[PDB]
Amino acid sequence: KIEEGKLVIWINGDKGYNGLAEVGKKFEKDTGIKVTVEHPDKLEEKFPQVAATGDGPDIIFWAHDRFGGYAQSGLLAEITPAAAFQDKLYPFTWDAVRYNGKLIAYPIAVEALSLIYNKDLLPNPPKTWEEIPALDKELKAKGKSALMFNLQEPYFTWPLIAADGGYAFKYAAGKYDIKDVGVDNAGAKAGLTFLVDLIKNKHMNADTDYSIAEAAFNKGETAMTINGPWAWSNIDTSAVNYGVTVLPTFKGQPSKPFVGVLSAGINAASPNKELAKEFLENYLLTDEGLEAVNKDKPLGAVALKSYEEELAKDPRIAATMENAQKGEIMPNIPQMSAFWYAVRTAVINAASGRQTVDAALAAAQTNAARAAALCRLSTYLEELEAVELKKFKLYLGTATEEGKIPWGSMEKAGPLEMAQLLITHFGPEEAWRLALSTFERINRKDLWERGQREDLV
Numbered sequence: 001k002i003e004e005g006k007l008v009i010w011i012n013g014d015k016g017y018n019g020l021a022e023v024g025k026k027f028e029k030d031t032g033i034k035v036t037v038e039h040p041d042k043l044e045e046k047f048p049q050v051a052a053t054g055d056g057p058d059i060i061f062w063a064h065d066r067f068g069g070y071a072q073s074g075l076l077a078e079i080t081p082a083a084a085f086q087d088k089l090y091p092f093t094w095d096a097v098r099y100n101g102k103l104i105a106y107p108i109a110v111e112a113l114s115l116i117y118n119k120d121l122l123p124n125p126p127k128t129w130e131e132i133p134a135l136d137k138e139l140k141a142k143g144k145s146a147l148m149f150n151l152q153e154p155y156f157t158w159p160l161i162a163a164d165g166g167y168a169f170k171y172a173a174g175k176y177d178i179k180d181v182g183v184d185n186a187g188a189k190a191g192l193t194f195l196v197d198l199i200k201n202k203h204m205n206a207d208t209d210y211s212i213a214e215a216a217f218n219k220g221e222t223a224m225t226i227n228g229p230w231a232w233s234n235i236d237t238s239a240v241n242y243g244v245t246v247l248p249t250f251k252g253q254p255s256k257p258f259v260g261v262l263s264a265g266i267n268a269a270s271p272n273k274e275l276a277k278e279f280l281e282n283y284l285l286t287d288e289g290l291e292a293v294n295k296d297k298p299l300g301a302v303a304l305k306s307y308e309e310e311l312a313k314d315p316r317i318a319a320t321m322e323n324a325q326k327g328e329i330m331p332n333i334p335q336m337s338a339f340w341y342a343v344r345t346a347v348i349n350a351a352s353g354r355q356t357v358d359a360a361l362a363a364a365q366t367n368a369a370r371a372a373a374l375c376r377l378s379t380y381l382e383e384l385e386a387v388e389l390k391k392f393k394l395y396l397g398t399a400t401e402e403g404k405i406p407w408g409s410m411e412k413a414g415p416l417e418m419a420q421l422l423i424t425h426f427g428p429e430e431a432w433r434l435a436l437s438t439f440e441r442i443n444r445k446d447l448w449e450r451g452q453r454e455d456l457v
Protein backbone atom coordinates (compact mmCIF):
# COMPACT_ATOMS: atom_id res chain seq x y z
CA LYS A 1 0.00 0.00 0.00
CA ILE A 2 2.04 3.02 1.25
CA GLU A 3 -0.32 5.44 -0.42
CA GLU A 4 0.28 9.16 -0.01
CA GLY A 5 -2.35 11.11 1.93
CA LYS A 6 -3.29 8.16 4.18
CA LEU A 7 -1.57 6.76 7.31
CA VAL A 8 -1.38 2.97 7.88
CA ILE A 9 -0.35 1.96 11.42
CA TRP A 10 0.62 -1.50 12.69
CA ILE A 11 0.38 -2.34 16.42
CA ASN A 12 0.36 -5.72 18.19
CA GLY A 13 -3.03 -7.30 18.86
CA ASP A 14 -2.62 -7.33 22.67
CA LYS A 15 -2.45 -3.50 22.70
CA GLY A 16 -5.27 -0.97 22.70
CA TYR A 17 -5.70 -0.69 18.95
CA ASN A 18 -9.38 0.35 19.08
CA GLY A 19 -8.39 3.28 21.27
CA LEU A 20 -5.59 4.17 18.84
CA ALA A 21 -8.14 3.99 15.97
CA GLU A 22 -10.19 6.56 17.88
CA VAL A 23 -7.15 8.85 17.91
CA GLY A 24 -6.93 8.22 14.15
CA LYS A 25 -10.54 9.36 13.62
CA LYS A 26 -9.84 12.62 15.40
CA PHE A 27 -6.87 13.10 13.09
CA GLU A 28 -9.09 12.42 10.09
CA LYS A 29 -11.80 14.82 11.32
CA ASP A 30 -9.26 17.58 11.91
CA THR A 31 -7.16 17.06 8.75
CA GLY A 32 -9.09 14.91 6.27
CA ILE A 33 -6.32 12.26 6.43
CA LYS A 34 -7.66 8.72 6.86
CA VAL A 35 -5.75 6.60 9.42
CA THR A 36 -5.99 2.81 9.24
CA VAL A 37 -4.93 0.81 12.31
CA GLU A 38 -4.11 -2.87 11.70
CA HIS A 39 -2.77 -5.62 13.98
CA PRO A 40 -1.16 -8.29 11.81
CA ASP A 41 0.15 -11.43 13.37
CA LYS A 42 3.96 -11.50 13.60
CA LEU A 43 3.95 -7.84 12.57
CA GLU A 44 7.43 -7.50 14.00
CA GLU A 45 8.81 -10.13 11.58
CA LYS A 46 6.74 -8.93 8.63
CA PHE A 47 7.78 -5.31 8.98
CA PRO A 48 11.45 -5.90 8.06
CA GLN A 49 10.43 -8.10 5.08
CA VAL A 50 7.97 -5.64 3.54
CA ALA A 51 9.76 -2.44 4.48
CA ALA A 52 12.92 -3.62 2.78
CA THR A 53 10.86 -3.64 -0.45
CA GLY A 54 9.81 -0.04 0.11
CA ASP A 55 6.36 -1.08 1.40
CA GLY A 56 4.69 -1.66 4.81
CA PRO A 57 2.84 0.56 7.26
CA ASP A 58 3.71 4.22 7.61
CA ILE A 59 4.09 3.74 11.40
CA ILE A 60 5.09 0.61 13.32
CA PHE A 61 4.55 0.07 17.09
CA TRP A 62 6.59 -2.47 19.04
CA ALA A 63 8.74 -2.55 22.13
CA HIS A 64 12.01 -0.73 21.54
CA ASP A 65 14.21 -3.88 21.48
CA ARG A 66 13.26 -4.59 17.78
CA PHE A 67 14.09 -1.14 16.52
CA GLY A 68 17.90 -1.30 16.46
CA GLY A 69 17.76 -4.06 13.88
CA TYR A 70 15.23 -2.13 11.80
CA ALA A 71 17.37 0.98 12.01
CA GLN A 72 20.60 -0.91 11.19
CA SER A 73 18.89 -2.26 8.06
CA GLY A 74 17.83 1.27 7.01
CA LEU A 75 14.07 0.74 7.55
CA LEU A 76 13.33 3.65 9.89
CA ALA A 77 13.33 7.40 9.31
CA GLU A 78 15.28 9.43 11.83
CA ILE A 79 12.78 11.44 13.83
CA THR A 80 13.21 15.17 14.37
CA PRO A 81 11.37 16.31 17.49
CA ALA A 82 12.10 19.92 18.42
CA ALA A 83 13.64 20.60 21.84
CA ALA A 84 10.29 21.71 23.21
CA PHE A 85 8.70 18.44 22.24
CA GLN A 86 11.56 16.36 23.67
CA ASP A 87 11.10 17.98 27.07
CA LYS A 88 7.58 16.54 27.17
CA LEU A 89 8.90 12.95 27.57
CA TYR A 90 11.11 11.37 30.19
CA PRO A 91 14.83 11.27 29.29
CA PHE A 92 15.22 7.56 29.85
CA THR A 93 12.46 6.82 27.34
CA TRP A 94 14.33 8.80 24.66
CA ASP A 95 17.45 6.80 25.46
CA ALA A 96 15.57 3.56 24.73
CA VAL A 97 14.91 4.76 21.12
CA ARG A 98 18.42 6.04 20.40
CA TYR A 99 20.54 3.96 18.01
CA ASN A 100 24.00 4.96 16.77
CA GLY A 101 23.34 8.40 18.20
CA LYS A 102 20.06 9.07 16.36
CA LEU A 103 16.46 9.01 17.55
CA ILE A 104 14.73 6.23 15.59
CA ALA A 105 11.25 6.13 17.16
CA TYR A 106 8.84 8.02 19.46
CA PRO A 107 8.68 6.35 22.89
CA ILE A 108 5.15 5.83 24.15
CA ALA A 109 5.02 3.84 27.38
CA VAL A 110 7.16 1.82 29.73
CA GLU A 111 6.09 -1.80 30.20
CA ALA A 112 7.18 -4.20 32.86
CA LEU A 113 5.77 -7.51 34.01
CA SER A 114 4.23 -7.70 37.51
CA LEU A 115 2.81 -10.44 39.72
CA ILE A 116 -0.99 -10.20 39.35
CA TYR A 117 -3.07 -11.87 42.02
CA ASN A 118 -6.66 -12.64 42.95
CA LYS A 119 -7.29 -10.95 46.31
CA ASP A 120 -10.21 -13.22 47.30
CA LEU A 121 -8.21 -16.40 46.80
CA LEU A 122 -4.91 -15.01 48.08
CA PRO A 123 -5.01 -11.88 50.22
CA ASN A 124 -1.25 -12.14 50.82
CA PRO A 125 0.71 -13.04 47.70
CA PRO A 126 4.07 -14.85 48.09
CA LYS A 127 7.29 -12.93 48.36
CA THR A 128 9.39 -15.82 47.00
CA TRP A 129 9.32 -18.27 44.10
CA GLU A 130 10.39 -21.00 46.52
CA GLU A 131 7.14 -21.01 48.46
CA ILE A 132 4.98 -21.39 45.38
CA PRO A 133 5.00 -25.23 45.38
CA ALA A 134 3.72 -25.35 48.99
CA LEU A 135 1.20 -22.66 48.07
CA ASP A 136 -0.01 -24.67 45.06
CA LYS A 137 -0.34 -27.85 47.14
CA GLU A 138 -2.83 -25.81 49.27
CA LEU A 139 -4.85 -24.41 46.41
CA LYS A 140 -5.10 -27.79 44.66
CA ALA A 141 -6.99 -29.22 47.69
CA LYS A 142 -9.34 -26.26 47.27
CA GLY A 143 -9.76 -27.01 43.55
CA LYS A 144 -7.52 -24.16 42.34
CA SER A 145 -3.91 -23.60 41.30
CA ALA A 146 -1.31 -21.11 42.49
CA LEU A 147 0.20 -19.74 39.30
CA MET A 148 -0.42 -19.77 35.54
CA PHE A 149 1.40 -17.63 33.02
CA ASN A 150 2.65 -17.87 29.42
CA LEU A 151 5.49 -20.37 29.24
CA GLN A 152 5.72 -20.17 25.41
CA GLU A 153 7.34 -16.67 25.17
CA PRO A 154 10.68 -16.16 26.92
CA TYR A 155 9.66 -12.59 27.88
CA PHE A 156 7.55 -14.10 30.69
CA THR A 157 10.15 -16.64 31.98
CA TRP A 158 13.16 -14.37 31.66
CA PRO A 159 12.51 -12.60 35.05
CA LEU A 160 13.20 -15.84 36.89
CA ILE A 161 16.11 -16.95 34.68
CA ALA A 162 17.85 -13.64 35.27
CA ALA A 163 17.07 -13.33 39.04
CA ASP A 164 20.22 -15.22 40.15
CA GLY A 165 22.50 -14.21 37.29
CA GLY A 166 21.24 -14.90 33.77
CA TYR A 167 21.84 -12.11 31.28
CA ALA A 168 21.52 -11.59 27.52
CA PHE A 169 24.73 -9.81 26.46
CA LYS A 170 27.29 -8.51 28.97
CA TYR A 171 27.14 -4.72 29.29
CA ALA A 172 30.14 -2.54 30.16
CA ALA A 173 31.50 0.90 29.28
CA GLY A 174 28.17 1.75 27.60
CA LYS A 175 28.33 -1.08 25.09
CA TYR A 176 27.10 -4.66 24.85
CA ASP A 177 29.53 -7.51 24.18
CA ILE A 178 27.78 -9.77 21.67
CA LYS A 179 30.36 -12.51 22.33
CA ASP A 180 29.56 -12.68 26.07
CA VAL A 181 26.10 -14.34 26.24
CA GLY A 182 24.77 -15.18 29.68
CA VAL A 183 22.06 -17.77 29.13
CA ASP A 184 24.21 -20.72 30.28
CA ASN A 185 25.73 -19.49 33.57
CA ALA A 186 25.01 -20.96 37.02
CA GLY A 187 22.24 -18.45 37.80
CA ALA A 188 20.33 -19.08 34.56
CA LYS A 189 20.58 -22.86 35.04
CA ALA A 190 19.23 -22.40 38.56
CA GLY A 191 16.22 -20.32 37.46
CA LEU A 192 15.22 -22.55 34.56
CA THR A 193 15.76 -25.65 36.70
CA PHE A 194 13.32 -24.17 39.18
CA LEU A 195 10.78 -23.56 36.42
CA VAL A 196 11.06 -27.13 35.12
CA ASP A 197 10.84 -28.62 38.67
CA LEU A 198 7.57 -26.67 39.01
CA ILE A 199 6.39 -28.49 35.89
CA LYS A 200 7.69 -31.93 36.79
CA ASN A 201 6.06 -31.57 40.21
CA LYS A 202 2.67 -30.80 38.53
CA HIS A 203 2.44 -27.20 39.75
CA MET A 204 2.42 -25.93 36.14
CA ASN A 205 1.75 -27.37 32.67
CA ALA A 206 4.49 -26.99 30.04
CA ASP A 207 1.94 -26.00 27.40
CA THR A 208 0.27 -23.10 29.16
CA ASP A 209 0.35 -20.11 26.86
CA TYR A 210 -1.06 -16.57 26.89
CA SER A 211 -4.74 -17.28 26.29
CA ILE A 212 -4.88 -20.27 28.66
CA ALA A 213 -3.34 -18.39 31.57
CA GLU A 214 -5.40 -15.24 30.92
CA ALA A 215 -8.65 -17.21 30.84
CA ALA A 216 -7.79 -19.25 33.95
CA PHE A 217 -6.93 -16.11 35.92
CA ASN A 218 -9.91 -14.10 34.77
CA LYS A 219 -12.30 -16.97 35.55
CA GLY A 220 -11.05 -17.34 39.14
CA GLU A 221 -9.31 -20.68 38.61
CA THR A 222 -5.74 -19.69 39.41
CA ALA A 223 -4.63 -17.45 42.25
CA MET A 224 -1.78 -15.72 40.39
CA THR A 225 -0.52 -14.85 36.89
CA ILE A 226 2.39 -12.86 35.44
CA ASN A 227 1.46 -10.23 32.87
CA GLY A 228 1.85 -6.62 31.78
CA PRO A 229 -0.40 -3.58 32.05
CA TRP A 230 -2.21 -4.34 28.77
CA ALA A 231 -3.87 -7.26 30.54
CA TRP A 232 -5.66 -5.23 33.25
CA SER A 233 -8.66 -4.15 31.10
CA ASN A 234 -9.81 -7.70 30.69
CA ILE A 235 -9.44 -8.42 34.42
CA ASP A 236 -11.40 -5.24 35.19
CA THR A 237 -14.32 -6.54 33.12
CA SER A 238 -14.29 -9.94 34.81
CA ALA A 239 -15.47 -10.52 38.32
CA VAL A 240 -11.94 -10.90 39.70
CA ASN A 241 -10.75 -8.44 42.37
CA TYR A 242 -7.02 -8.32 41.71
CA GLY A 243 -3.88 -6.58 42.83
CA VAL A 244 -0.59 -5.93 41.05
CA THR A 245 2.64 -6.31 42.98
CA VAL A 246 6.35 -7.06 42.88
CA LEU A 247 7.47 -10.32 41.27
CA PRO A 248 8.67 -13.06 43.66
CA THR A 249 12.32 -13.28 44.60
CA PHE A 250 14.44 -16.28 43.73
CA LYS A 251 17.26 -17.32 46.06
CA GLY A 252 16.64 -13.97 47.78
CA GLN A 253 17.27 -11.92 44.52
CA PRO A 254 14.60 -9.82 42.76
CA SER A 255 13.10 -11.25 39.61
CA LYS A 256 14.58 -9.03 36.86
CA PRO A 257 12.21 -8.47 33.95
CA PHE A 258 13.33 -7.09 30.65
CA VAL A 259 11.63 -3.71 30.45
CA GLY A 260 10.14 -2.67 27.08
CA VAL A 261 9.42 0.83 25.90
CA LEU A 262 6.46 0.70 23.47
CA SER A 263 7.71 2.88 20.60
CA ALA A 264 6.35 4.17 17.26
CA GLY A 265 8.83 4.19 14.38
CA ILE A 266 8.28 5.83 10.96
CA ASN A 267 8.93 3.66 7.88
CA ALA A 268 11.94 4.96 5.87
CA ALA A 269 9.91 4.37 2.68
CA SER A 270 6.83 6.27 3.78
CA PRO A 271 5.80 9.28 1.63
CA ASN A 272 3.80 10.49 4.66
CA LYS A 273 6.61 11.22 7.14
CA GLU A 274 5.35 14.71 8.00
CA LEU A 275 1.78 13.54 8.56
CA ALA A 276 3.10 10.67 10.74
CA LYS A 277 5.17 13.16 12.71
CA GLU A 278 2.12 15.38 13.20
CA PHE A 279 -0.07 12.41 14.18
CA LEU A 280 2.46 11.14 16.76
CA GLU A 281 3.54 14.45 18.34
CA ASN A 282 0.25 16.39 18.23
CA TYR A 283 -2.42 13.75 18.52
CA LEU A 284 -1.07 10.57 20.09
CA LEU A 285 1.52 11.93 22.51
CA THR A 286 -1.00 14.19 24.22
CA ASP A 287 -3.07 13.69 27.36
CA GLU A 288 -6.23 12.97 25.34
CA GLY A 289 -4.48 10.73 22.85
CA LEU A 290 -2.79 8.52 25.40
CA GLU A 291 -5.95 8.46 27.55
CA ALA A 292 -7.88 7.13 24.55
CA VAL A 293 -5.45 4.24 24.09
CA ASN A 294 -5.08 3.60 27.82
CA LYS A 295 -8.85 3.24 28.33
CA ASP A 296 -8.86 0.46 25.72
CA LYS A 297 -5.84 -1.46 27.08
CA PRO A 298 -3.64 0.21 29.71
CA LEU A 299 -0.25 1.36 28.43
CA GLY A 300 1.71 1.18 31.67
CA ALA A 301 3.86 4.17 32.72
CA VAL A 302 3.62 6.53 29.80
CA ALA A 303 6.55 8.49 28.42
CA LEU A 304 4.49 11.77 28.46
CA LYS A 305 5.28 13.48 31.77
CA SER A 306 1.97 15.34 32.10
CA TYR A 307 -0.10 12.17 31.80
CA GLU A 308 2.31 9.97 33.72
CA GLU A 309 1.95 12.21 36.79
CA GLU A 310 -1.75 11.23 37.00
CA LEU A 311 -1.07 7.52 36.29
CA ALA A 312 1.75 7.35 38.88
CA LYS A 313 -0.91 7.66 41.65
CA ASP A 314 -2.28 4.21 40.65
CA PRO A 315 -0.71 1.45 42.81
CA ARG A 316 -0.80 -0.84 39.76
CA ILE A 317 1.50 1.65 38.01
CA ALA A 318 3.57 1.98 41.19
CA ALA A 319 4.04 -1.78 41.07
CA THR A 320 4.86 -1.75 37.36
CA MET A 321 7.62 0.82 37.97
CA GLU A 322 8.92 -1.07 40.99
CA ASN A 323 9.29 -4.17 38.89
CA ALA A 324 10.86 -2.08 36.06
CA GLN A 325 13.53 -0.71 38.41
CA LYS A 326 14.36 -4.27 39.54
CA GLY A 327 14.94 -5.30 35.94
CA GLU A 328 16.83 -3.82 33.04
CA ILE A 329 15.79 -1.87 29.95
CA MET A 330 16.18 -4.16 26.95
CA PRO A 331 19.14 -3.54 24.65
CA ASN A 332 18.05 -2.43 21.20
CA ILE A 333 21.00 -3.87 19.32
CA PRO A 334 20.24 -5.86 16.12
CA GLN A 335 21.34 -9.05 17.92
CA MET A 336 18.41 -8.96 20.40
CA SER A 337 16.24 -11.12 18.10
CA ALA A 338 19.04 -13.80 18.09
CA PHE A 339 18.97 -13.79 21.87
CA TRP A 340 15.19 -14.10 22.04
CA TYR A 341 14.83 -16.89 19.46
CA ALA A 342 17.54 -18.94 21.19
CA VAL A 343 16.04 -18.52 24.65
CA ARG A 344 12.56 -19.32 23.40
CA THR A 345 13.73 -22.70 22.07
CA ALA A 346 15.65 -23.47 25.22
CA VAL A 347 12.70 -22.82 27.54
CA ILE A 348 10.26 -24.82 25.42
CA ASN A 349 12.63 -27.77 25.06
CA ALA A 350 13.47 -27.90 28.78
CA ALA A 351 9.83 -27.49 29.87
CA SER A 352 8.57 -30.22 27.56
CA GLY A 353 11.37 -32.63 28.59
CA ARG A 354 12.78 -32.62 25.07
CA GLN A 355 16.17 -31.65 26.53
CA THR A 356 17.68 -31.27 29.94
CA VAL A 357 18.17 -27.76 31.33
CA ASP A 358 21.96 -27.95 30.98
CA ALA A 359 21.74 -29.11 27.35
CA ALA A 360 18.91 -26.68 26.42
CA LEU A 361 20.85 -23.74 27.83
CA ALA A 362 24.22 -24.88 26.42
CA ALA A 363 22.61 -25.03 22.97
CA ALA A 364 20.91 -21.63 23.48
CA GLN A 365 24.23 -19.97 24.26
CA THR A 366 25.87 -21.45 21.15
CA ASN A 367 22.88 -20.62 18.95
CA ALA A 368 22.67 -17.01 20.24
CA ALA A 369 26.42 -16.39 19.94
CA ARG A 370 26.47 -17.85 16.43
CA ALA A 371 23.42 -15.88 15.24
CA ALA A 372 24.75 -12.68 16.83
CA ALA A 373 28.09 -13.17 15.05
CA LEU A 374 26.33 -13.84 11.76
CA CYS A 375 24.41 -10.59 12.18
CA ARG A 376 27.61 -8.57 12.70
CA LEU A 377 29.60 -10.29 9.95
CA SER A 378 26.73 -9.85 7.47
CA THR A 379 26.52 -6.14 8.23
CA TYR A 380 30.24 -5.73 7.59
CA LEU A 381 30.26 -7.70 4.33
CA GLU A 382 27.30 -5.61 3.10
CA GLU A 383 29.69 -2.61 3.30
CA LEU A 384 31.98 -4.12 0.68
CA GLU A 385 31.71 -2.91 -2.89
CA ALA A 386 30.81 -5.68 -5.27
CA VAL A 387 34.35 -5.59 -6.65
CA GLU A 388 35.82 -5.77 -3.12
CA LEU A 389 33.60 -8.75 -2.21
CA LYS A 390 35.08 -10.58 -5.25
CA LYS A 391 38.64 -9.96 -3.99
CA PHE A 392 37.51 -11.05 -0.51
CA LYS A 393 36.32 -14.42 -1.83
CA LEU A 394 39.69 -15.11 -3.51
CA TYR A 395 41.42 -14.45 -0.19
CA LEU A 396 39.10 -16.74 1.75
CA GLY A 397 39.10 -19.45 -0.94
CA THR A 398 42.65 -20.23 0.25
CA ALA A 399 41.75 -20.37 3.96
CA THR A 400 42.64 -23.79 5.44
CA GLU A 401 40.52 -25.67 8.01
CA GLU A 402 38.47 -30.01 7.43
CA GLY A 403 37.93 -29.07 3.81
CA LYS A 404 38.29 -25.60 2.30
CA ILE A 405 35.40 -23.57 0.86
CA PRO A 406 34.90 -24.54 -2.82
CA TRP A 407 34.87 -21.84 -5.47
CA GLY A 408 31.37 -22.72 -6.68
CA SER A 409 30.03 -22.15 -3.16
CA MET A 410 31.28 -18.59 -3.05
CA GLU A 411 31.06 -17.67 -6.70
CA LYS A 412 27.55 -16.21 -6.74
CA ALA A 413 27.04 -15.86 -2.97
CA GLY A 414 26.00 -12.41 -1.70
CA PRO A 415 27.13 -10.89 1.59
CA LEU A 416 24.68 -12.82 3.78
CA GLU A 417 25.36 -16.19 2.19
CA MET A 418 29.11 -15.51 2.45
CA ALA A 419 28.71 -14.69 6.14
CA GLN A 420 26.89 -17.99 6.57
CA LEU A 421 29.48 -20.02 4.66
CA LEU A 422 32.33 -18.55 6.74
CA ILE A 423 30.54 -19.14 10.02
CA THR A 424 29.39 -22.65 9.12
CA HIS A 425 32.93 -23.59 8.03
CA PHE A 426 35.20 -21.77 10.54
CA GLY A 427 32.99 -21.02 13.55
CA PRO A 428 32.11 -17.49 14.69
CA GLU A 429 35.44 -16.52 16.25
CA GLU A 430 37.65 -17.56 13.34
CA ALA A 431 35.20 -16.33 10.69
CA TRP A 432 35.46 -12.85 12.19
CA ARG A 433 39.25 -12.89 12.48
CA LEU A 434 39.61 -13.91 8.89
CA ALA A 435 37.21 -11.26 7.66
CA LEU A 436 38.88 -8.54 9.74
CA SER A 437 42.34 -9.37 8.38
CA THR A 438 40.98 -9.60 4.84
CA PHE A 439 39.48 -6.09 5.12
CA GLU A 440 43.00 -4.83 5.84
CA ARG A 441 44.40 -6.76 2.83
CA ILE A 442 41.81 -5.50 0.30
CA ASN A 443 42.36 -1.91 1.51
CA ARG A 444 39.22 -1.22 3.56
CA LYS A 445 41.07 -0.03 6.62
CA ASP A 446 37.92 1.84 7.63
CA LEU A 447 36.03 -1.44 8.10
CA TRP A 448 39.12 -3.03 9.64
CA GLU A 449 39.48 -0.24 12.22
CA ARG A 450 35.79 -0.12 13.10
CA GLY A 451 35.63 -3.90 13.38
CA GLN A 452 38.69 -3.92 15.69
CA ARG A 453 36.76 -1.53 17.95
CA GLU A 454 33.80 -3.93 18.24
CA ASP A 455 35.62 -6.44 20.45
CA LEU A 456 37.60 -4.01 22.62
CA VAL A 457 36.41 -3.96 26.24
Ligand SMILES: OC[C@H]1O[C@H](O[C@H]2[C@H](O)[C@@H](O)[C@@H](O[C@H]3[C@H](O)[C@@H](O)[C@@H](O[C@H]4[C@H](O)[C@@H](O)[C@@H](O)O[C@@H]4CO)O[C@@H]3CO)O[C@@H]2CO)[C@H](O)[C@@H](O)[C@@H]1O
Binds near residue numbers: 063064065066111155
Ligand atom coordinates in the same frame (compact mmCIF):
# COMPACT_ATOMS: atom_id res chain seq x y z
O1 LIG B 1 9.01 -18.37 15.74
C1 LIG B 1 8.97 -18.06 17.13
C2 LIG B 1 8.25 -16.87 17.30
O2 LIG B 1 8.87 -15.75 16.42
C3 LIG B 1 8.24 -14.44 16.68
O3 LIG B 1 8.53 -14.00 17.99
C4 LIG B 1 9.88 -13.51 18.24
C5 LIG B 1 9.95 -12.02 18.02
O4 LIG B 1 9.87 -11.85 16.60
C6 LIG B 1 11.16 -11.35 18.59
O5 LIG B 1 10.94 -9.90 18.44
C7 LIG B 1 11.28 -11.62 20.07
O6 LIG B 1 10.16 -11.18 20.73
C8 LIG B 1 10.37 -10.53 22.00
C9 LIG B 1 9.98 -9.06 21.86
O7 LIG B 1 10.80 -8.37 20.82
C10 LIG B 1 10.07 -8.32 23.14
O8 LIG B 1 9.56 -6.97 22.97
C11 LIG B 1 9.17 -8.98 24.15
O9 LIG B 1 7.86 -8.91 23.66
C12 LIG B 1 6.75 -8.62 24.53
C13 LIG B 1 6.25 -7.24 24.30
O10 LIG B 1 7.39 -6.36 24.59
C14 LIG B 1 5.13 -6.92 25.24
O11 LIG B 1 4.67 -5.57 24.90
C15 LIG B 1 3.98 -7.87 25.07
O12 LIG B 1 3.49 -7.74 23.76
O13 LIG B 1 4.44 -9.25 25.18
C16 LIG B 1 5.59 -9.64 24.23
C17 LIG B 1 5.95 -11.01 24.54
O14 LIG B 1 4.88 -11.86 24.05
O15 LIG B 1 9.58 -10.34 24.29
C18 LIG B 1 9.41 -11.20 23.04
C19 LIG B 1 10.01 -12.42 23.46
O16 LIG B 1 9.10 -13.19 24.23
O17 LIG B 1 11.34 -13.06 20.28
C20 LIG B 1 10.17 -13.90 19.73
C21 LIG B 1 10.60 -15.24 19.86
O18 LIG B 1 10.32 -15.59 21.20
C22 LIG B 1 6.76 -14.51 16.40
O19 LIG B 1 6.04 -13.29 16.79
C23 LIG B 1 6.08 -15.66 17.06
O20 LIG B 1 4.71 -15.64 16.55
C24 LIG B 1 6.76 -16.95 16.81
O21 LIG B 1 6.08 -18.05 17.46
